[PDB]
Amino acid sequence: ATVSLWETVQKWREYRRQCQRSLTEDPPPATDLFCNRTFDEYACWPDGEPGSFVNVSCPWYLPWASSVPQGHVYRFCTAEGLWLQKDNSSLPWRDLSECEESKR
Amino acid sequence: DLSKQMEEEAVRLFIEWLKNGGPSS
Ligand SMILES: CCCCCCCCCCS[C@@H]1O[C@H](CO)[C@@H](O[C@H]2O[C@H](CO)[C@@H](O)[C@H](O)[C@H]2O)[C@H](O)[C@H]1O
């Protein structure tokens, strides 16, 4: 209901702070092949299991987060323990379609 | 009203900025 760039930036900085805490303190995975946890600036990713989709909840700082409570963003962890990318130079594949704002 | 609607767009732009990689950059 409230629009505030200021409030939204502050929620994003809090989500980033909580994420950094998880990245620092979460125990290492159950060995030793896993895609590595990261904060991509939009979402906080945990370590991935090889050959798996990894889903995290839509970031709670989104102004419309309460409209998408069961939505998830996805990455894919390849069997080699690397995040799926696309081509040569690209960022990791991500699907955030469930977290988008519009009704349609 | 108008300024609230324009702030709303600024906020969408901020979110698009993060999706595009944010401070990374
Ligand atoms: C190229 C296409 C191949 C597709 C193969 C199968 C796709 C794997 C699915 C992606 S990971 C999956 O995400 C799910 C969330 O969407 C996750 O489900 C969770 O949340 C859901 C909320 O809607 C809910 O249905 C479940 O009860 C809940 O456990 C699920 O853990 C995760 O593996």
XYZ file of C-alpha atoms and ligand atoms in Angstrom:
162
model
C 0.000 0.000 0.000
C 2.743 2.526 0.930
C 5.110 3.616 -1.757
C 8.508 4.652 -0.417
C 11.820 4.448 -2.259
C 13.502 5.174 1.084
C 11.699 2.342 2.928
C 12.359 -0.069 0.067
C 16.122 0.704 -0.080
C 16.300 0.253 3.702
C 14.536 -3.136 3.485
C 16.919 -4.178 0.737
C 19.952 -3.174 2.934
C 18.469 -5.264 5.790
C 17.866 -8.256 3.518
C 21.509 -7.816 2.336
C 22.799 -7.684 5.990
C 20.836 -10.835 6.951
C 22.087 -12.539 3.810
C 25.739 -11.690 4.571
C 25.248 -13.150 8.033
C 23.987 -16.457 6.497
C 26.824 -16.501 4.025
C 29.338 -16.085 6.897
C 27.785 -18.338 9.494
C 25.925 -21.172 7.674
C 27.799 -24.508 8.142
C 29.655 -25.872 5.035
C 27.584 -28.308 2.977
C 27.661 -32.084 3.422
C 30.732 -32.335 1.211
C 32.381 -31.363 -1.026
C 30.652 -30.915 -4.366
C 28.071 -28.082 -4.216
C 27.425 -24.807 -6.021
C 28.547 -21.967 -3.727
C 26.193 -19.717 -1.759
C 26.087 -16.103 -2.877
C 24.199 -12.815 -2.792
C 23.540 -11.708 -6.384
C 22.146 -8.338 -5.148
C 18.493 -9.429 -5.712
C 18.418 -12.725 -3.916
C 20.366 -14.682 -1.316
C 21.365 -18.151 -2.598
C 22.357 -21.013 -0.286
C 24.867 -23.688 -1.358
C 23.305 -25.887 -4.080
C 23.133 -29.680 -4.353
C 24.646 -30.872 -7.717
C 21.987 -31.728 -10.341
C 19.255 -29.765 -8.546
C 17.017 -26.755 -8.883
C 17.509 -24.377 -5.967
C 14.493 -22.297 -4.949
C 14.468 -19.340 -2.550
C 11.424 -17.245 -1.517
C 10.738 -14.051 -3.428
C 12.903 -11.403 -1.667
C 10.906 -9.954 1.218
C 11.981 -6.343 0.442
C 9.878 -6.289 -2.843
C 7.134 -3.719 -2.403
C 4.604 -6.355 -3.564
C 6.155 -9.296 -1.564
C 2.881 -9.890 0.347
C 1.164 -10.636 -3.056
C 3.629 -13.455 -3.785
C 3.989 -15.313 -0.466
C 4.566 -18.775 -1.958
C 6.573 -17.555 -4.961
C 10.174 -18.657 -5.540
C 13.115 -17.668 -7.597
C 15.228 -20.451 -9.062
C 18.709 -21.322 -10.025
C 20.074 -24.623 -11.290
C 23.113 -26.404 -9.806
C 24.793 -28.505 -12.515
C 26.192 -31.989 -11.771
C 29.705 -30.472 -11.849
C 29.019 -28.290 -8.789
C 28.709 -25.097 -10.822
C 25.675 -22.847 -11.219
C 24.111 -23.185 -14.687
C 24.973 -20.084 -16.795
C 24.160 -19.900 -20.535
C 27.214 -18.861 -22.582
C 30.904 -18.293 -21.807
C 30.600 -14.826 -20.213
C 27.091 -14.798 -18.778
C 25.692 -14.555 -15.262
C 24.057 -17.664 -13.699
C 20.646 -18.684 -15.110
C 17.934 -17.478 -12.778
C 14.124 -17.587 -13.046
C 12.313 -14.946 -10.978
C 9.023 -15.066 -12.939
C 6.986 -16.047 -9.829
C 8.251 -12.866 -8.062
C 7.197 -10.380 -10.745
C 4.817 -7.622 -9.853
C 1.998 -7.660 -12.428
C -1.217 -9.686 -12.103
C -0.732 -10.828 -15.737
C -0.910 11.396 -6.477
C 1.332 12.145 -9.503
C 4.472 12.390 -7.365
C 3.461 9.195 -5.508
C 3.020 7.419 -8.874
C 6.410 8.663 -10.020
C 8.050 7.459 -6.769
C 6.446 4.085 -7.441
C 8.202 3.984 -10.810
C 11.489 5.005 -9.180
C 11.094 2.045 -6.837
C 10.451 -0.339 -9.825
C 13.574 1.095 -11.413
C 15.506 0.453 -8.203
C 14.331 -3.206 -8.300
C 15.241 -3.485 -11.987
C 18.693 -2.100 -11.052
C 19.161 -4.942 -8.466
C 17.921 -7.569 -10.957
C 20.505 -6.240 -13.410
C 23.197 -6.769 -10.805
C 22.883 -3.766 -8.493
C 26.173 -2.546 -6.976
C 27.800 -5.382 -9.083
C 27.033 -3.195 -11.081
C 13.318 -27.994 -17.799
C 12.208 -28.301 -16.805
C 12.502 -29.466 -15.847
C 11.699 -29.314 -14.547
C 11.961 -30.460 -13.558
C 11.369 -30.261 -12.147
C 11.437 -28.819 -11.631
C 12.000 -28.697 -10.211
C 11.218 -27.729 -9.331
C 12.022 -26.497 -8.912
S 12.576 -26.620 -7.228
C 11.181 -26.885 -6.182
O 10.472 -25.669 -5.955
C 9.294 -25.829 -5.154
C 8.623 -24.472 -5.059
O 8.133 -24.107 -6.340
C 9.652 -26.364 -3.762
O 8.453 -26.716 -3.084
C 8.074 -25.942 -1.930
O 7.335 -24.771 -2.299
C 6.145 -24.942 -3.104
C 5.387 -23.609 -3.096
O 4.577 -23.518 -4.285
C 5.209 -26.084 -2.651
O 4.554 -26.607 -3.833
C 5.902 -27.203 -1.836
O 4.984 -27.817 -0.920
C 7.125 -26.738 -1.032
O 7.795 -27.864 -0.449
C 10.514 -27.615 -3.882
O 11.085 -27.915 -2.612
C 11.668 -27.418 -4.853
O 12.311 -28.652 -5.122
